[PDB]
Design a protein around this ligand. Structure first.
Ligand SMILES: Cc1nc(-c2ccc(C(F)(F)F)cc2)sc1C(=O)N[C@@H](Cc1ccc(O)cc1)C(=O)O
Ligand code: NA
Lengths: 187, 188
């Protein structure tokens, strides 16, 4: 029983050439921590979607002050090096659980400890490839008039509405969320 | 340590009458709350340094958890009603955050049963007026201190701990600084 306003909302001005599935998060975002560590939303959405569908995940600037911008640049590094899955957990825990991530250096340490060579990290950090990925993340958020995280957009036309879903059972919530993404992608 | 308003603690503009002597707020969904309790043992270390007669109170809140969050607050009310907080705190934190075995109210109940509380006793407590009242008490206390987030601790409804705020460069030092601050405030 899908209804606009319930499981999802519809953007007023759809974004052209938008990614099929686009997620925004912040490492400072508490629901984003839950979505990644506890619920594994991205993994479960991926499992429910066809192989052909591309999922994109971008970091945002508007949580966490100066460190917030640094983390967006760090996420650009992770995308450029293809090590998202190596650093997502220690970045989330470093920010929200242990609160040991306080500076860019602390972010660098996380990449080092996750097996990324220091020289490779620094080269990426300062690269124009990464500068462009930072620009891409910012523009994407601006295109959908992003006001908060977590957020997921389907074909630049629909936005998921987790608030409209059932939150008594974690796996029911995940099922309803993932099923909504599939429904919207086939729309 | 040299204590100053605004440093190790802040002072509520609207103090709360009849508040518990030492009141801690947490959520089982809250990862820094997991850090506080399961890793740092803040509650326990504060209690060790508390003066004789001063009891600790700990309430559950629901900023992140939706309906399941409400179930957790009611289950925490049951833990308080039964006096089994020290038996279920660990498996609730680990079950929600680490093993991800706690996904519904039924899984919460299973934790109490595995910790030695009979199912019929858990259910009796769950549906009791005592637990209904305790749920309301936890909410009201959070409202009274204008709670913004967790973890948080309040002393005599007048002072709010400010860990920000403290030497969080060494976890052992942080814990003693935090516990010493609670002792100081309780003595004022
Ligand atoms: C993004 C988000 N995700 C949530 C969620 C997801 C899963 C689960 C479960 F445990 F079941 F897995 C619980 C909550 S609330 C939530 C969220 O946006 N929460 C709001 C408050 C709110 C909560 C429930 C409503 O029906 C309406 C408003 C806030 O934090 O201010
Ligand atoms: Na605190």
């Amino acid at each position: 029983q899908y209804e606009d306003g319930k499981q999802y909302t519809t953007l007023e001005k759809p974004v052209a050439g938008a990614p099929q599935v686009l997620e925004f998060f912040s490492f400072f975002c508490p629901h984003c921590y839950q979505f990644e560590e506890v619920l594994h939303i991205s993994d479960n959405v991926k499992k429910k979607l066809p192989e052909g569908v591309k999922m994109t995940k971008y970091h945002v600037n508007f949580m966490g002050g100066d460190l917030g911008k640094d983390l967006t640049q760090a996420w650009a590094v992770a995308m450029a090096l293809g090590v998202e899955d190596k650093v997502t957990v220690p970045l989330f825990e470093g920010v929200q659980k242990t609160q040991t991530i306080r500076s860019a250096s602390d972010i660098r340490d996380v990449f080092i400890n996750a097996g990324i060579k220091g020289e490779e990290y620094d080269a990426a950090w300062n690269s124009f490839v990464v500068k462009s990925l930072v620009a891409q993340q910012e523009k994407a958020a601006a295109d959908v008039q992003l006001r908060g995280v977590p957020a997921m957009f389907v074909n630049g036309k629909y936005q998921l509405n987790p608030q409209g879903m059932d939150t008594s059972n974690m796996d029911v919530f995940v099922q309803q969320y993932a099923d909504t993404v599939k429904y919207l992608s086939e729309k």
